[PDB]
Amino acid sequence: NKRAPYWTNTEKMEKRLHAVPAANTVKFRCPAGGNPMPTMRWLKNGKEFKQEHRIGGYKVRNQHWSLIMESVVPSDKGNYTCVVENEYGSINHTYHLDVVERWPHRPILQAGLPANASTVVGGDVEFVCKVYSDAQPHIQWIKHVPYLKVLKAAGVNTTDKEIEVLYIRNVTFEDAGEYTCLAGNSIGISFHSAWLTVLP
């Protein structure tokens, strides 16, 4: 019973977009059947996929109609198409690969921020704080009064959208002192302090 190529397990093919954390192995499969035994080719962005198209190349296990790429990186992003065929037909399926780099570190703040500030009573002043983190960071501003006072803390009511900058209008001699921006995530905590000096 000679027949054109067909997918023998469409279940394993439903997931078209494969987004994985960098450094992981990706295995694309296109289980096929058909008599005679159809052949298989893989394309990267519609063009032939050669071993030199990526460091380390890739591996193919014909027995399982799969394409294997180890330790993927961002540049591997793109479309991968499997082309199966025999004398009675030719069918293809395309997968999209997307690589995401994780950054497993406690929050990191920009050196120098917040910066020291000076002003005469009644004046306005601000402290900026630039944070970078993969895991969602929690930022809060604290004044030293170790006697600490939370002046502002991120949350549903105090979005990150404006938590990075701290304003203090009509500052008073009371306001003087050490301000700190503290950022923390599941991995750890980090903070940078600045000093506000109020003059007569």
Binding site: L17, A19, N24, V100, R102, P104, A135, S186
Partner: protein, 134 residues
């Protein structure tokens, strides 16, 4: 450092089936594969260290896990809208309810969510990879 910025809205891609977490305007919660779907752009916000809320931007609702383990999106933030965000050793994120401490936000291979009561650390339904909102 990797591109993305922590305050930007994100898409939560689930290893299990490749579905993006979607939050419907009527509070319905599920997953889809179409990256263009407007109800998958989410806003994560830390309420305190390691704990966050997940707001469907469009639906303008917050992801929440009820007593029974069911997942839905409420217009108003409650104590069931907070999840411990963890970056696992495998580099995927998991969202464990802060209220119901053993239940994870997850998606069945079908595209429907999976009851918190039926999830576990070793499962693949609870693995999400945060991605940019194009």
């Amino acid at each position: 450092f990797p591109p993305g910025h922590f305050k930007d809205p994100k898409r939560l891609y689930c290893k299990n089936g490749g579905f993006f977490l979607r939050i419907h305007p009527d509070g319905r919660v599920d997953g889809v594969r179409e990256k263009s779907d407007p109800h998958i752009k989410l806003q994560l916000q830390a309420e305190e260290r390691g704990v966050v809320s997940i707001k469907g931007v469009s639906a303008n609702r917050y992801l929440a896990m009820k007593e029974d383990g069911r997942l839905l999106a409420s217009k108003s933030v409650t104590d069931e809208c907070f999840f411990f965000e963890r970056l696992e050793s495998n580099n995927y994120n998991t969202y464990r309810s802060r209220k119901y401490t053993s239940w994870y936000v997850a998606l069945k291979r079908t595209g429907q969510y999976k009851l918190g009561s039926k999830t576990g650390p070793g499962q693949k339904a609870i693995l999400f990879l945060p991605m940019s909102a194009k």
